[PDB]
Structures are given as structure tokens and as C-alpha cells.
Amino acid sequence: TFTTAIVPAAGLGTRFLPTTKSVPKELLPVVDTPAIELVADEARQAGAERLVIVTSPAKQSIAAYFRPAPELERSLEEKGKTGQLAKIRRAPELLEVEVAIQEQALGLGHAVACAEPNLGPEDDVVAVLLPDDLVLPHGILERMAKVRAEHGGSVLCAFDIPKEEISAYGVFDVSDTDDADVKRVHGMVEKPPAEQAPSTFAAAGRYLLDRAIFDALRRIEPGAGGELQLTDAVALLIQEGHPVHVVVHRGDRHDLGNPGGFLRAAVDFALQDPDYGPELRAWLTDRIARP
Amino acid sequence: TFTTAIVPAAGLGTRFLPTTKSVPKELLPVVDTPAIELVADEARQAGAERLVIVTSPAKQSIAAYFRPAPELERSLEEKGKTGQLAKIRRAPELLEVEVAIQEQALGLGHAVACAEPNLGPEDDVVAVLLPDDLVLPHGILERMAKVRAEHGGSVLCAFDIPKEEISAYGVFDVSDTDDADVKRVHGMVEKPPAEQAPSTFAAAGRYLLDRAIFDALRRIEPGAGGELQLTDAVALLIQEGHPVHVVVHRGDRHDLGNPGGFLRAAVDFALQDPDYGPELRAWLTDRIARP
Ligand SMILES: O=c1ccn([C@@H]2O[C@H](COP(=O)(O)OP(=O)(O)O)[C@@H](O)[C@H]2O)c(=O)[nH]1
Ligand SMILES: O=c1ccn([C@@H]2O[C@H](COP(=O)(O)OP(=O)(O)O)[C@@H](O)[C@H]2O)c(=O)[nH]1
Ligand code: NA
After folding, report:
1. Is the CB of A115 under 6 A from ligand 1?
2. Is there a contact between B22 and A270 if contact means CB atoms under 8 Å apart?
């Protein structure tokens, strides 16, 4: 049981210039649907009632997407576009949405800290979903919530990636529990060489964090500019005997962080859509047989 | 010889809801570059010195895209990201851009009519580029200008589409000239059944229009709700003996009007981009051979 999910959405998306000069990265469509909607939908399916979106001053339009649009709805109703009407009603009815402002892009720990004013006394634990990761099928947070129910404390997420390929990620130092997909976390190493990787478990952008994380984020050594390393806040909770576990995702994943990975997501989803799939698959079938 | 290009961009992209509730269709990226920049570049490559973008009040932001971004530019300089800096300076430096408002989306003829106040004393001919078409590899307007230099009057654009796939388009009733890719236009049929199509030449969204089109757009019978169609204006000029020719494009084209056509564009470009091609091709080889 968490009721509040936090989405850190305050980057620029340099890798998507020049589009992200004018469009927030999180509003970019996967086929026809903004990435932020796909992440809100995952959060709702795992039981979120509220979504706190952390954004920069210039990207406040992310949240405006989740507000009703009576005029557009009326216009669409008047033209009998009932299918398109349902699509625009979906995000505003998923859950309650609020914005927290991160004044400057000081990193992920700082972003999470910026959400604390939006929490209530009922928020003993909060979900955190990074919008550049899609984790499929939906439900990693449900597996994580079961871990929290049995062990208390905080829960993280990993992908299983061979050591030869993991050096770009944070890698957990782990030991076994009674469940093979659930590991006790002793720590994390940033970007180990293959030979020094403590495991094949690479950190993924899903979190179920005890409310104690906020106090840990205030107690850690800030960075040069005021960057608060979420990883250091987790290490502090560990040192103070807070239970931290990880669930290993065994499904598919997509990385919306660069245009290449984004395009893979979009093709993957379009090919399953009966409106787009057949005609795109036939086109692709010929396109890739030629230069 | 034209210096002004008009881009009608005032539709809602219904086919891209729910994204187009918040993001103008014409700012959506093809790999990482907004559609509108690709169209602007085609215009500039045909010798346009000015872009008049016709848009709705809701979609004026398509304007800011073409403005300098000082703080963003300085940030990239400071980080030494010379290649990304060039990406964001490309659009503002392509050509002069201005905006004309279409208050309500009453059709393409009405949209073109909205750009008339932006014309100066030398705009005897104007280019029109529909932003949902890409004409590859090198556009077509330079070829159209040559036709206008030979014959006077106005020039249209067609794709060569088999009769059994042509029924979604306007189809020209034509006769031959000396040049196999230039036809004399006698008329245009809307959405003929295959067996009735007067040719395989489907109307494409490029035009080189004599200034006389604005008077034709004033004299044609408005629609049920005030919809002027460019079609009726062209037919009226033809009736009055205005010469109308069409150039048949034989190269490639993309349709950015729907999510399917848009992804085909993105995959086409990414496969030719060395940053994505080889790996994307293999990904695609596997992906299309499974549901
Ligand atoms: O809510 C957030 C999300 C990210 N970031 C930071 O902003 C950058 C993320 O940029 P993004 O994820 O948009 O990717 P880019 O394309 O800019 O590299 C990194 O420095 C993150 O630490 C942040 O401060 N707040
Ligand atoms: O500048 C323009 C461009 C289009 N339209 C009209 O708007 C509709 C098309 O909208 P759009 O091209 O965005 O496509 P959609 O996704 O809505 O079908 C057609 O009736 C066009 O004639 C318009 O009034 N002004
Ligand atoms: Na560019």
C-alpha cells in the first residue's frame, strides 16, 4: 500500500534536441500517446491515487496534460469521434496529479526531495517511477509492494544484465532471500568494470521508498552544486539498519532516454496495434530487405 | 520566381490524440527533428526567403521554435556540446518566419487565404507546402518553378499511385506535355473509385500558385460552414483560362498525417543514419518476424 507516486520529469532531454528546445521530452508520443501517460498508467495499475510530477519551471505543461479539456471534448463529441474522446479522457481520470517545481536540475535525489511538501501523513511509503524507463508487463511495483509487506523498509528494482554489458549501470551488491527474484541489498556500485561487478543486477528506475528516505536525503553530504545522491541516501538507510531489498524484473523494458531506444518502443507498440501494425509490418518487411 | 512559402498548419491532429491535446502535430519529431523544420528546410532549399506559417491561436508555439534560444545556446556552449548547439541554431537561421492566424479550421483554401495580409508587392507567385507531406530526396518546388517559367500560371504536384490504391486522394484529369513528368491539368476528381480514376496522378501537398488564387478564393461559393477548398479555386482559374500544370514526383515520400506514416518516416531516416542504422536493422529483422 502506497497511494502516492512521484515522477521526476525535470531533465532537458539534450539527447532529443532540437525537439526538446520546444517540447518536453515526457510529452513526446509513443505511437500516439505521451510517455508521461504510459508511466501514469503503470502507477495507477499498481494502486496510486495521486501522482506528483517533479518538473522545471519551463516544463509545467507536463501537468496541464492531465487537466480536463472541456472544449476539445465537446468538439470531438459534436463530430461523433467517440474513440478519440475516450483517449483524451483517459489521463485526467487516471488519478489526481500535482506539480512540484525543481528550480534547477540538481539530480534525482534532489528531485525526489522536492516532492516532500506534496505528501500527507498517510504517505508511509511512496513509489518513484523514472519516465525514461518502461517496464513491461505492468506490475513491477506490485511485486515490490509484496516485498515491502513481508520485510518492511524500502524496495528497489533491477534488470538482470550480463557483467560484460553492465558497466554503464549502478550494480547491486546482493544476497539471496526465500524468493529467487527478491534480493537483499547490501549496497550499490556505480559503473563497475565487468571484473569488479558485484552481481548481474543493474539498477532500474522504479522505487518503493519508505518515508525515511526524506530524512536520509537531508542528512547526506550534498554535491558541488547541491546535488543529493539518491544512492547515498539509500546507503545511509542501509548503514542505519533499514531493510532494503530489490526485485528483479523478468519482463521486457524500453529506454526512452535516446531517440534510438524511443523509436524501438514506438515500433514495438505500433506493431501490436491492429490500426497500424499490419500496414507498418508490411512496409518494414520490404524496407529492411533494401539499403 | 517565388520568395514566400506558406505552410498551412492550423489543423488539430485528431489522428495523433491524445498527444495533440498538448503538443502541436508539426512539432512532433522525426527521429529527433520536428516535422516543421524538415518542411522549412525544403522551402529554403527551393529558394524561399520567408515562411508564413498559418496556425490556430492554440498552436502559435510552432512560432517560438524558429526563434533563438539564448540561455539554451549558452548552456550547450558551456558544456562544449558543439554538435547539439548547431542542431538548435539550424532552424532559426534557415529563413525569416512569420505567423498568420486561422481563427477556426475552415479548410485549406481558407488557410491559404489567411496568409494574404502577409504578402508584399513582389509576391506574384507563392509556394504552399502542406506540413504532412515530405517530398524526397530534394523536394520538387525548383522543378515546379521551371514549369511556371516555361508556361506561366500555376503548378501543382502529384504522386504516381496505382488506381487500386488511389481512392483516398484527389486525382488529376491530365494531358501530356513534351516532358513525361509534366502534365497539363484539366481538372481533379475527389476520391474516385479505382475504375473511375482519370489517371494515376494523386494530388500532393505542394503548390506554386499565382497571386490570382486569392481572388479565386474570394469568388468561390463558400461551403456549408464557410469551408473554402483550394480545389474549387484552382478549377475556377482553369475555367478562366489560367494555365495549370502538374509535376509528377518520382522519388520517395512520407505521410506524417497519421502515427503509422510518421513511424515509417522515422525508421526510413534512422536506418540511413549511421548512429542507429546497423543495430536498428537487426532489431527490426527480429521484431517484424514476431507479432
Ligand atoms: O526530475 C529530474 C530528472 C532528471 N534530472 C537531472 O537532469 C538530467 C536528466 O536529463 P534527461 O533525463 O532529460 O536526459 P538528457 O537528454 O538531458 O541527457 C540529469 O542530470 C538528471 O540528474 C533532474 O534534475 N530532475
Ligand atoms: O492550416 C490548415 C490545415 C488544415 N485545415 C483543415 O483541418 C483538417 C485537417 O486537420 P489536420 O491536418 O491536422 O489532420 P487531422 O489529424 O485533424 O485529421 C482539414 O479539414 C483541413 O482542411 C485547416 O483548416 N487549416
Ligand atoms: Na537541427
Report:
1. no
2. no
CA distances from A176 to A180, A181, A199, A237, A244 (A): 7, 9, 12, 19, 13
Q: Which helix (H) or strand (E) holds B47?
A: none
CA of A24, closest CA in chain B: separation in Å? 9
HEC per residue, B138-204? CCCHHHHHHHHHHHCCEEEEEEECCHHHCCCCEEEEEEECCCCCEEEEEEEEECCCHHHCCCCEEEE
- Of residues B255, B153, B253, the one with CA closest to residue B208: B153
Approach to solving: X-ray
| Beta pairing partners, B126 | B209
| Residues A98 and A50 sit within 8 Å (Cβ to Cβ) | yes
Length of chain A: 291
Is A278 known as a binding-site position? no
Nearest chain A residue (CA) to B266: A263
What span, in angstroms and rounded, lies between the C-alpha atoms of B274 and B149?
40
Place of cell 521484431: B287
Neighbours of ion ligand 3 (CB under 5 A): A 18; B 87, 90
| Spatial contact of A186 and A175, defined as CB atoms under 8 Å apart | yes
Q: Do B276 and A284 make contact, defined as CB atoms within 8 angstroms?
A: no
Q: What is the resolution of this structure in A?
A: 2.1
The dihedral sign for the CA sequence B225, B229, B235, B240: positive
Nearest CB to A84; choose among B14, B88, B268: B14
Domains of chain A: 4-257 (3.90.550.10)
Q: What is the DSSP string of A87-142?
A: HHHHHHHH-EEEEEE-SS---HHHHHHHTGGG--TT-SEEEEE-TTEEEESS-HHH
Instruction: Count how many pairs of residues, chain A against chain B, have C-beta atoms within 8 Å.
Output: 141
The residue assigned the cell 539498519 is: A241
Contacts of residue B283 in chain A, CB cutoff 8 Å?
264
CA distance A50 to A97: 6
Closest-CA distance of chain B to residue A150, Å: 38
Residue A99 identity (one-letter amino acid): V
Residue of A nearest to B287 (CA): A268
Closest CA in chain B for residue A88: B18
